[PDB]
Structure formats: structure tokens, C-alpha cells
Design a protein around this ligand. Structure first.
Ligand SMILES: *[C@@H]1O[C@H](CO)[C@@H](O[C@@H]2O[C@H](CO)[C@@H](O)[C@H](O)[C@H]2NC(C)=O)[C@H](O)[C@H]1NC(C)=O
Ligand SMILES: [Mg+2]
Length: 440
């Protein structure tokens, strides 16, 4: 994709922190960028859209390469068009942003580095990541996500000749769902066999998907939360097609683990731990601390454990323990835990099959990009996060019940109509050595 020059691109500023052993943190000038899929896409000018709604202009895009060559991503009106705003160290992502001719649903942004051109690269092994979240405005069917993906620092600028836009315009997204809704993958328009969605006027899918390792630190709404590593048998952002994308029917055939090895306190058998008025009280702001422990506690150790702590109202809250029949007590993610839970829940252990935490830590060594988003789920209505899933399964079968939301909740059309003013606020982002990001 080329660079559109109709509208200046200015990344909303966001202050984050870097912490040292002992607890001293310093502030850092960073910013956020909107994912390229949301952007206006058009010719150099004479200005005609290359894409609108869920269809392409076939004259400008007769093939993937010509399309990338002809088509330019433009600047974004962050607050007024996309409902994205920042104040100090806080990012607000609004769910539905109405306009005269269209409605914007959700958003996805990436944290920019100090240079405001390339994405910030995080090296998470032997490190701790903290942030504060307010989910009071995220009901059933919504997801305020903070996570990491193995994107290129330049979003594909240097790798792909016909990507001339790069990270400044939020290109190069990938994750373990290997999304095929992505418009540009590998500097080529994803138009081969393009199918406009019959149930979503904003989305289509092409032949290709964009896959990479993903650490889901936080997928949550007021009701429930999950922390979930996912791995792939490929290194970095990789284009897939056919069975490798593991689309729908061939979910467990592809190159990435779509389910991931998840820790949802409610799913792991503690229904009183997290939610409105619970131990971690989702009616108010709280801190989420995530520690990435290695085998020998060095930066070259194998990633061996992912621990979680919360901090609310000045109190440090230890993660809940698993409470599943036949299953041992774990309060953290280890390869051992992953084997145990996939077995206990009768799930395909793709996480371990594709190399488990070792492979995840190797992604961390290469480097990962920080993603923040708000979204609804056109695939499974967010039921996997906050309800009973599969809906056809017994609600008392271990692993089925993930939250208190109704199996009829989270239909996109319904939540967009009924809960348009939903929002998530992520704030006070911190990175440093284990034990440095929070006060005991
Ligand atoms: C769900 O998690 C909470 C929080 O850890 C548990 O409540 C604690 O129970 C332990 C006993 O192991 C005691 O130390 C405390 O009284 C509780 N702590 C707090 C902060 O309330 C609760 O037991 C868990 N529920 C289940 C079913 O395992
Ligand atoms: Mg290029």
C-alpha cells in the first residue's frame, strides 16, 4: 500500500514507564497508531476509493500487486472518526463511533517507539509488564484487549517492496487467528477470491491470512478475563493460505494455535474471583501485572512460567488457583498446566504441539509489538470469554463455563445497537524487571 497525503497522520501521544530494580520508574514519550485496515484507501488523485465497505474497485485493483501500487492509506481523524483519544498516560478506546455516512465499530492500535515511525519492540522474557484498566463500560459480548504480537518493527516496510506505508500507517498486523480479513498482507492487496461478508457489511476475506506468535496478556470485559499465550510453527509475520490459515473447519490444521493455553479464573473453577464486586473488582480501575519467568531467572533462560498479580485499592492480589476436578492446583501458566488443562477440558493441545512456552519465549526474544483494541466477535459472540462455550455442551462439563453472560449475548448487531457507548481505558503502562512495576 502507498501513502495517502490528503490528511496528515499524527499519532496520539501516550506516556508510558520504564522501571528499574527497586521500583524506580521513569516516564517515556510514546504514542499510538491506528491499524491500516480501518484507514481510508484511495488513489494518489484523481481521488477514487480502492475500497469501500467490504468491496474493492476492480479497475484499480485488477490483481494484488497493481492494487498495492495504485492504492494509498491516508491519515486518521482519531477521536472524531475512530473514537480513540489519549490523555497523559491513559488511552480511551470507544466501541461505536457514528458518522454522517458510516459507523465505526471497534479499533485496534499499536504502541509506537520513541521515533514515532516504527513500533516499540518489547523483549518480554525475564520481564514484568503492568498496566491499569477500567472495564466498567465493557459489558457481555465486548473485549478490551491488551496483547503482544510478533509484528515487524516497521510493519513490513523493508520486507515488502510494494508496502511503502509501513508502521507509520499501522500495516503488517498478524496474530494466531491468521486473519484473512486483512486488506494488505506482504505488500499485496488480499483480493484473490475476495468474498464480501454476508453478515458484516464492514468486512470481507481474501485468500490469504496473516499469522504470527501472540501473547494475549488481557482479553476481558466487566464479567470475565483470560490471559493466553498462543504459538505458531513460523517465526514472525507470515502469510498463509489454504489449510495453513486454519480457517473455520480446519481450525486445528493450520500453522498457529487458535485456542491458546488460556487462564480464565472463572473457567479454571473460581467464579468469585474477578467481576463486579468480586476480589478483583471490575466496577473500578485496577492494575494487571504479568511476569514472564525463565528457567534460571535470566534473559537467556527458556520461558517457563507466566505469572499474574493484580493491584487494587492499594492491595496486591495473588492470582486465583485452579479448581478443576482431577486437575492439580496451578495459579500460573506452565507447559505442565497447559498439558493438564487441555486434557481436563478435552481440548486439542495445539499450544504444546506447536512448541509451547519455549516457542513463545523465542518470539519474545525476536521482539513483540504492543496492541490495544476494543472489539465484538463475529465468529463466536465473545461466548468463549464470558459465557458457556460451546453452547451445545453441558454447562457443568469442566471448561465449558467461562462466565455468567447468556449464550444469546454478544451478537455484534445486537451489542452495536444496544451498547454503542461502551469503552475501555488502558493507562499507566509499565515495563521492567520482575517485581519492579508495582508496590508491594
Ligand atoms: C477463589 O479465589 C479466592 C482468592 O484467592 C479464594 O479466597 C481465598 O481463600 C483462601 C483459602 O485458600 C484464603 O486464604 C482467603 O480467605 C481468601 N482470600 C481472599 C483474598 O479472599 C477462594 O477460596 C477461591 N475459590 C475457590 C472455589 O477456590
Ligand atoms: Mg516497502
Amino acid at each position: 500500500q502507498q501513502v495517502g497525503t490528503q490528511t496528515a497522520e499524527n499519532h496520539p501521544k501516550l506516556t508510558v514507564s520504564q522501571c528499574s530494580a527497586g521500583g524506580s520508574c521513569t516516564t517515556e514519550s510514546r504514542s499510538v497508531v491506528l491499524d491500516s485496515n480501518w484507514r481510508w484507501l484511495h488513489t494518489t488523485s484523481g481521488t477514487t476509493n480502492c475500497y469501500t465497505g467490504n468491496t474493492w474497485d476492480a479497475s484499480l485493483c485488477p490483481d494484488p500487486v497493481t492494487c498495492a501500487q495504485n492504492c494509498a492509506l491516508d491519515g486518521a481523524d482519531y477521536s472524531g472518526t475512530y473514537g480513540i483519544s489519549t490523555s497523559g498516560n491513559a488511552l480511551t478506546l470507544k466501541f461505536v463511533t457514528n458518522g454522517p455516512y458510516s459507523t465505526n465499530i471497534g479499533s485496534r492500535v499499536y504502541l509506537m517507539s520513541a521515533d514515532d515511525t516504527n513500533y516499540e519492540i518489547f523483549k518480554l522474557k525475564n520481564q514484568e509488564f503492568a498496566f491499569d484498566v477500567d472495564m466498567s463500560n465493557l459489558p457481555c459480548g465486548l473485549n478490551g484487549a491488551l496483547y503482544f504480537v510478533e509484528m515487524d518493527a516497521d510493519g513490513g516496510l523493508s520486507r515488502f517492496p510494494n508496502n511503502k506505508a509501513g508502521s507509520k500507517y499501522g500495516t503488517g498486523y498478524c496474530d494466531t487467528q491468521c486473519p484473512q480479513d486483512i486488506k494488505f498482507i506482504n505488500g499485496e492487496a488480499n483480493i484473490l477470491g475476495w468474498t464480501p461478508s454476508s453478515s458484516d457489511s464492514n468486512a470481507g476475506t481474501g485468500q490469504y491470512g496473516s499469522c504470527c506468535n501472540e501473547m494475549d496478556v488481557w482479553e476481558a470485559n466487566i464479567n470475565s478475563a483470560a490471559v493466553t499465550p498462543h504459538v505458531c510453527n513460523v517465526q514472525g509475520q507470515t502469510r498463509c493460505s489454504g489449510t495453513q490459515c486454519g480457517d473455520g473447519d480446519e481450525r486445528y490444521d493450520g500453522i498457529c494455535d487458535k485456542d491458546g493455553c488460556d487462564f480464565n479464573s472463572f473457567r479454571m473453577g473460581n467464579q468469585t474471583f474477578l467481576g463486579p464486586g468480586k476480589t478483583v473488582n471490575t466496577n473500578s480501575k485496577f492494575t494487571v501485572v504479568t511476569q514472564f519467568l525463565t528457567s534460571d531467572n535470566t534473559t537467556t533462560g527458556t520461558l517457563h512460567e507466566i505469572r499474574r498479580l493484580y493491584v487494587q485499592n492499594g492491595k496486591v492480589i495473588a492470582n486465583s488457583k485452579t479448581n478443576i476436578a482431577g486437575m492439580s492446583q496451578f495459579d500460573s501458566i506452565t507447559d505442565d498446566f497447559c498439558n493438564a488443562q487441555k486434557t481436563a477440558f478435552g481440548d486439542t493441545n495445539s499450544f504444546e504441539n506447536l512448541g509451547g512456552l519455549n516457542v513463545m519465549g523465542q518470539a519474545f526474544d525476536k521482539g513483540v509489538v504492543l496492541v490495544m483494541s476494543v472489539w465484538d466477535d463475529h465468529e463466536a459472540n465473545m461466548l468463549w470469554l464470558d459465557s458457556d462455550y460451546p453452547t451445545t455442551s453441558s454447562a457443568s462439563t469442566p471448561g465449558v463455563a467461562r462466565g455468567t453472560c447468556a449464550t444469546t449475548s454478544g451478537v455484534p448487531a445486537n451489542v452495536e445497537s444496544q451498547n454503542p457507548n461502551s469503552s475501555v481505558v488502558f493507562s499507566n503502562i509499565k515495563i521492567g524487571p520482575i517485581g519492579s512495576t508495582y508496590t508491594a
